[PDB]
Amino acid sequence: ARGPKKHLKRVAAPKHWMLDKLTGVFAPRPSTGPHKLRECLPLIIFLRNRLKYALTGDEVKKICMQRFIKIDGKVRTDITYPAGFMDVISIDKTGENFRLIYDTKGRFAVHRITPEEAKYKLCKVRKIFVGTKGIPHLVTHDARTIRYPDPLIKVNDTIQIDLETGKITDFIKFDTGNLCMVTGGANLGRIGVITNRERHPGSFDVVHVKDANGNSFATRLSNIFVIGKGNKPWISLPRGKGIRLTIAEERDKRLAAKQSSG
Template sequence: MVSIMGKKAGSNRLKRQMMPAFWQVPRKAYRFAIRPIPGPHPIDRCYPLGVLLRDVLKVVSNMRETEKVLHNGYVYVDGVKRYDVHFPVGLMDVVELQPLKKVYRLVPRDGLILKPIEIAEGEKMEKEKNLKICKVVRKHTVKGGRIQYTLHDGRNILDDPKLNGITINDSILIKVPGQEVIDTVKMEKGALALITAGDNAGTTGRIVEVKEGTITLPKRVVVESDSKRLEIPADIVIAIGRERPLLSI
């Protein structure tokens, strides 16, 4: 008798030797770690929510406590309750821990691709926890001749008068969990920029030149920071403001 079985789903765990380098998890303590589920961020540029709470923020002691905290609806990501320890959190995401009254934004810092930075409690926290800077990674025309903008965290925004002139690599300040457009920043000379990957991850500076790509080279951005100039691929640079950053980073 031939048994017919459906295709097995992917594993929900990851060997620790295969973890991204920026995960602050001991590699030799245990064999496996949590694997992020497919979602708004790629696996090499995100934390699973369980790892963030247990190993990075250290607000829980073990995964059983983590699951209980999430099940009770105490954790919000970009203003939405999240219940899954595997949910991926990445660049510019806002994580709110309601019982502790703490809010964190994930940004590059100190050479790490992602590091949670606490937003100071008070008026600033109440304002900034609902705001997020997103980078435009795709722009195309959809049915009906409408323009759709795809952002770095998988969001899509259809025609909006505030986005006239905005193109790929520019940034949009939106309100979460909705997607109301608050402000925009073009990736152009004079804008403030943040490097999101590589040895200079977390470095901020002012754009002094934007170089168009060629057949062999990608589009590059020259960023001036601390009296030195860095020529970085535009893919790993995000515009964060004009005279000053739109948010605390």
């Protein structure tokens, strides 16, 4: 190429968007924003494919630029605006609130939340640095810079932040025995408590996590988002509680649900 790309082919789109093959040759191509291209759900896919208020992209544009959709309390009219993990979507006209968090299968669940839960969000701290005139700054996973954080907050810790103002309100350390959710890799969407973090200098750390059913799985340190302190999550969880069922028990649950109703 001679410069940056503007198009996303539909088969080359992220698979967890759940787009089909025959609607077009193109996928909605997320704008630049606080989330990566491969780790976000654009607003057009949310309002059309998942939530089904709209039937076309033109109807998505008509919804969005009537100024109805807030992402983290800010009105967005970009139809391809990249929304990602822990982002709060508020529709004040229909009175709906959502958090973009993952299913046990690694797809952004339609997770409805309470309007008091939509006041805040959680962020994973990605860097701590001191800037000019000795002013400490943190940078989160969603491109937020906060000046003057708590001196106890470190990288990989999780801040509980207020969307009305944007300041630090509470925080959770990275420690063995805290609750976490996996935001990348093969264990995307699973939830469990951290049991062992092994360190590899000059390389990636590997965190071992144990499920509430006793299953154990490892990930990298980049894929760990600490959610709750010890055992109780600080946000609402989806219908599955991070418990990945195997295909056998999922078939059994489907058959029992078909037997009970019908």
